[PDB]
Structure formats: C-alpha cells, structure tokens
Design a protein around this ligand. Structure first.
Ligand SMILES: C[C@]1(c2ccc(-c3nc4ccccc4c(=O)[nH]3)cc2)NC(=O)NC1=O
Ligand SMILES: C[C@]1(c2ccc(-c3nc4ccccc4c(=O)[nH]3)cc2)NC(=O)NC1=O
Ligand SMILES: [Zn+2]
Ligand SMILES: [Zn+2]
Lengths: 203, 208
C-alpha cells in the first residue's frame, strides 16, 4: 500500500513542515537526557506518506467522530516519535503503539512539541539511544519523526501540575511546554509526513 | 541547574519509591478533608532530582551536623508536600518553606506518612483544593510529592496529642502519642538539611 514521495526543499509544503518542526523545539526538564541536547535540527528529508487504504480508514473514522461532535473532527497536525515508525507508515497505528504507562492514561501519544516526540524515537525515555552508538544525544545517526493528522473530536481536558474521543494533556508547571494528546483508536491518526533529521549540536 | 530524570516503572528504584508511597497511606482524623479520601495512589511518574550544587550544599551541611553529633547524620528519607514543589527542586529548601504555625514549632516539616504530606500539596489544610475543581479530594488532577533525604542529627523527641533549633538539637521528631498507626513527623530549621531526591507525580485513587 505505502509509497513515500520526496518533497523538495524548495516546495512550500516542505518549508511549512520544516518550520513547524523547528519552531516547536523546547528545552526539556530532563536537560536533554532522553532526546539529547539541541535547539534545532538538521532536516535531511521530508516525505509525504501516501497509502489510499490507510487514508480511507482515517477519513471514515474521522467522519464518525465529526458526526458525534456537531460536525467537528477537531483535527490537528501533531508529532509522533517511535521505534516503530516503519510499521506505522506501512500498517497504520494500532494498540501495540499505545504507551501503556502514559502520564495521561494508556493510549497512542502525540505532541505539539516536536522535541517531545524526539524523546521517543529510540523508545521510552530515549531507551539506550541510537542503535549504532548507544547515544541518546547522538548527532550523527539519522532520526525520523512522523508529522500526523490526528482527529481529537471531543477531547477530555486533563491538567498536570466515554463521551470523549481523546485526552488533551494540558501543561501546567513547565510554562514552556505545549500540549500532548492521546487517542485510543489507531484509525484516528494518519501519518502524513515522514521526517528524517539529525539533532544539531549547539554553538 | 536542576535536571529531572525519569525512572522506569521496571526500575527497582521506581518500585521502592512507589512502595514507600503506597505503604505509608493512612486514615486521617479529618476524614479526608485536607488531602482527600483514598487508600492508595495512582503513580504517574517518578523522577530523580539531580542538581550538583544543591547536593553539595546538602552534603556540606550533613557533614557539619554529623560531626556535631558524634559522626551520626541521622539521615532519613521523608515526604514533603508543598504548593512550591517546583521552586524547591530548583532553589532547594529555605525559610520560605517553613510552616510557621506548625505543631512542633516554626520550621520545615517532613512526614513518614505519604498521606500526611499529601494534605499539604494544595496548601496548609489543603487550601481550597485543586486549582481547577477547587476539590481537595480531586481524583482527576495530578499532584506532586517530594521524597527527600533529610539530616536529623540530634533530634528532639516531642510528643503530640494526636525559627531556631531546640537546645543543641538539629531537628524535632514529632511523635503522635494517641494514634499509634500515625507515623512520625519531623522539623528542620535549615533548608540545607534536606535534599529533594525524588519528585513523584500521582493521583489519589477513588476507593470502591
Ligand atoms: C515504543 C512504544 C512507545 C511509547 C511512547 C511513545 C510516545 N510517547 C509520547 C508521549 C508524549 C508525547 C509524545 C510521545 C510520542 O511521540 N511517542 C511512542 C512509542 N512503547 C509502547 O508500548 N508502544 C510503543 O509504540
Ligand atoms: C505552604 C507553606 C507550607 C506549609 C506546610 C507544609 C507542610 N507541612 C507538613 C506538616 C507535617 C507533615 C508534613 C508536612 C508537609 O509535607 N508539608 C508545606 C508548605 N507554608 C509556608 O509558610 N511555607 C510553605 O511552603
Ligand atoms: Zn548514533
Ligand atoms: Zn481537579
């Protein structure tokens, strides 16, 4: 089903996805333990992820949700990082992609902060870091994030210090952090862009 | 200078800290008024607090106390709840964090019962409860406690009915004399005598 199409760096679509990726980088309270130390990325590639059957699975679920929420899908574009980005662009999101111990309750997690999703590229907590150097802050190995179309519908607003289709994990302390979100059905997200980058060591 | 490092639920360090939380829940004489009604917590996250500077400030004070007490720091792990948990992990403890009207005197209070420290998450007596529902028994909103390394030194034993250190003492141990299920509470006078080692984020859990 799945084909990847390169966006040229000169394409406006490449440029708006890049800018979203760069501009939603923030400092993390772990000092970069999980995701490494950086303020921006070297963007290597941006690919549109085209799969007709996964896309129809998304629009169909989107429909159902809009119709349970006064015609409002409450659709966002959000980041997702995972060691399973390959399975996801081929087979779609599903239960095995759910973060069981997630801070806002078991489900599939998405972030407004690209740098938050970056923390999960090598697994929970950055796991053991890159597979080549075991370096969570590796500046050499290439990473991927997905920039995804997510249907939130009626979102349960949860604060950190049934009748809902998602949870919004609002930040409270950390007046720097953006929102995180959780869906319970894989069909409510579609992995539209695949972004290959390095994190860049600061000056 | 503070960094917070997540511990994994599979880490035995995570597990020891959680069990310390859970196993020290008790009934309170307020029926849950200040801290809410619960028998256990839902632990969302445990982070180690790393800050090289506050840590040296802690150990320098501990050595002093230890020496003044015949080489016994009398160091414990104790809970602390406070609306200012975020400041404390950055700045450490100082006299801003002293409960002036505390039962065992003006100073900085620590509990062996996690549920006792939980009564202070939203202020003394639980203030007006969570910032969003104004509900002191809120089962939805996230709370944080600190589990801290605390130097007692020579501790003055004070019995209860339930500023400046006492004469040549480095702390007070407050021991409830009526209720023997209640565990001890402690007071220090110097912020440097405590280090916030873990930050635990949790919800109290509704019982059935
Ligand atoms: C590796 C895996 C997992 C866990 C969490 C995340 C993840 N968690 C997040 C939490 C907050 C914000 C973003 C993310 C995010 O982009 N990704 C990704 C994959 N853990 C798991 O049980 N299934 C997964 O797919
Ligand atoms: C809010 C504040 C305060 C007062 C009491 C407590 C507190 N009091 C306790 C008393 C007994 C046992 C534990 C605690 C405990 O964990 N925390 C914490 C903060 N009052 C204050 O003057 N400074 C504070 O930080
Ligand atoms: Zn590497
Ligand atoms: Zn609340």
């Amino acid at each position: 089903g799945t084909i990847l199409i390169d966006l040229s760096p000169d394409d406006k679509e490449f440029q708006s996805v890049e800018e979203e990726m760069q501009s939603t980088v923030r400092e993390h309270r772990d000092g970069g333990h999980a995701g490494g130390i950086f303020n921006r990325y070297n963007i290597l590639k941006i690919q549109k992820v085209c799969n007709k059957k996964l896309w129809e699975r998304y629009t169909h679920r989107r429909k159902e949700v809009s119709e349970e929420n006064h015609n409002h899908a409450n659709e966002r574009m959000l980041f997702h990082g995972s060691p399973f980005v390959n399975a996801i662009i081929h087979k779609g999101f599903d239960e095995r992609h759910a973060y069981i111990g997630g801070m806002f309750g078991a489900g599939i997690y998405f972030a407004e902060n690209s740098s938050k999703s970056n923390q999960y590229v090598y697994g929970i907590g950055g796991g053991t870091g890159c597979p080549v150097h075991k370096d969570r802050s590796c500046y050499i190995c290439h990473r991927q994030l997905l920039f995804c179309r997510v249907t939130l519908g009626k979102s349960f607003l949860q604060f950190s210090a049934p009748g809902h289709h998602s949870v919004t994990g609002r930040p409270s302390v950390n007046g720097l952090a953006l929102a995180e979100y959780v869906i319970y059905r894989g069909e409510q997200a579609y992995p539209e862009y695949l972004i290959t980058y390095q994190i860049m060591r600061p000056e």
